[PDB]
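Endo-beta-1,4-xylanase rMxylcd
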Amino acid sequence: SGSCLTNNQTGTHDGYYYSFWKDSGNVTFCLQSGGRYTSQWSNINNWVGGKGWNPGGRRTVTYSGTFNPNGNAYLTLYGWTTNPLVEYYIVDNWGTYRPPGGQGYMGTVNSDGGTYDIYRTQRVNAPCITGNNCTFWQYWSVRQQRRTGGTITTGNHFDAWASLGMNLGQHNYMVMATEGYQSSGSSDITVG
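Predicted structure tokens:
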């Protein structure tokens, strides 16, 4: 049994941690069975959410499902660390915009049968886990080719990032998320 959420919320469902956040707009985030969740969004500015773990860390994440963006949206492992404060992404799929627009390219890393471009970008006046209006660095791993489903060996990415001076702090949550920006669409993802 699961409920569909329309307001920001975090918790645990069917053994999996989940985080659902948006600054404004309409998103229906449904807690399906096990590690599954579905989402449908529209009339939004920004939103991100999914099922996963808290805390995150080195892990072989397995996920599957569908991703149907109508504009700008990402299908990505998403998490945070503190001290330092970092927002990280391991993007497997995207819509009309491939993040982060090539900004802050650092190199590449091979993992789970694919090659990912690595980027590091800074954010300002942005919401973060420790409050609102924060500034912090974002670490990115973006697949060179779109994919919807497979394994994501987080350690492979964390290590490449570290080698490039992109160090992580104490792990907070880590989920297989769907993110949207001024767009609409849907997703159906099961994590393990």
